[PDB]
Swiss-Prot record:
Entry keyword set: Disulfide bond, Endonuclease, Hydrolase, Lyase, Nuclease, Signal
Protein name: Guanyl-specific ribonuclease T1
Domain of life, per lineage: Eukaryota
GO MF term (any one): RNA endonuclease activity
Catalytic activity: [RNA] containing guanosine + H2O = an [RNA fragment]-3'-guanosine-3'-phosphate + a 5'-hydroxy-ribonucleotide-3'-[RNA fragment]
Transmembrane segments: none
Keyword Lipoprotein: no
A GO cellular component entry from the record: cell septum
Amino acid sequence: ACDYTCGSNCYSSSDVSTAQAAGYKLHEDGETVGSNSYPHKYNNYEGFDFSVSSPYYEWPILSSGDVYSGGSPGADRVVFNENNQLAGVITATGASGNNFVECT
């Protein structure tokens, strides 16, 4: 089936790693992409039980299988810290307001 499921989307650990590495390479390069400038800090107002240390960053993960390069961010994100440890996979898909819900 799917390593991670974000609402309707199905992502495999390869998907997640392709998105995390990209994600992380810009953050170490002091760069960003798009109107809302990703990757950027993730706050954790949801209170997720992420066992890797903060701070956290979020990067769009796309259902198309493309690596985010500006434009529509989509509702799913990858969350990584400074050691490039995966915190988890979240989506805006299914929550109340700005809440994110964790992908399954």
